[PDB]
Amino acid sequence: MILDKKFHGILDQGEGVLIIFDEPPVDKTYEAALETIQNMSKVVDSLYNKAKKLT
């Protein structure tokens, strides 16, 4: 059920220690990574227009 991600937790065999944690700011790295991936096409297309007009 942790592999199913229904709640926050992780098991243990050697020590049996239970740890519960969460990561609230999920909407930052998604929007940032999408801006990087979308801007890659912008810079590459710019290099296509300049590479087309120069050579």
Binding site: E15, G16, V17, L18, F21, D22, P24
Partner: protein, 152 residues
């Protein structure tokens, strides 16, 4: 009633044992104590759930203070077994103890020290501390600056 009002200091119930005993003995006032103990089981439920109710209520009072009373030592000062303290925790899981921290190795519990998001908790504390120092510093500074004007 004053001991049950607020700020319940951790005291021994043995002092209340003779108080309840004389409460059953004296007939000048609160006479129907034998009527409280009329039924063979109802009075026992009122007494066991009474001492249980105050031994949970004092936990709810000391839970506001973050002093880390170290309930492992508290179980030694109260002279009771840790098993019925685990049953008391079984009363806390229905008493909304979800805001707590336990330990696998030791037995000390923590009613504080959350994950502490710095954007909410330390944000709030720094806001009230810094701003309170700013406006509180602002009031008595010029207020005293007006208090010294009368010396001329």
């Amino acid at each position: 009633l004053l001991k049950l009002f607020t700020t319940m200091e951790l005291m021994r119930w043995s002092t209340l044992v003779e108080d309840y005993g004389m409460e059953l003995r004296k007939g000048s006032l609160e006479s129907p104590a034998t009527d409280v103990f009329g039924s063979t089981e109802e009075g026992e439920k009122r007494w066991k759930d009474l001492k249980n109710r105050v031994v949970e209520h004092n936990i709810r009072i000391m839970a506001k203070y973050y002093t880390r009373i170290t309930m492992k030592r508290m179980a030694q000062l109260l002279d009771l077994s840790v098993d019925e303290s685990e049953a008391f925790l079984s009363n806390l899981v229905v008493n909304k103890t979800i805001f707590a921290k336990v330990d696998r190795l030791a037995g000390i519990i923590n009613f504080q020290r959350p994950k502490d998001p710095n954007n909410l908790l330390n944000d709030w504390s720094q806001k009230l501390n810094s701003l309170m120092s700013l406006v509180n510093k602002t009031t008595h500074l010029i207020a005293k600056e007006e208090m010294i004007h009368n010396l001329q």
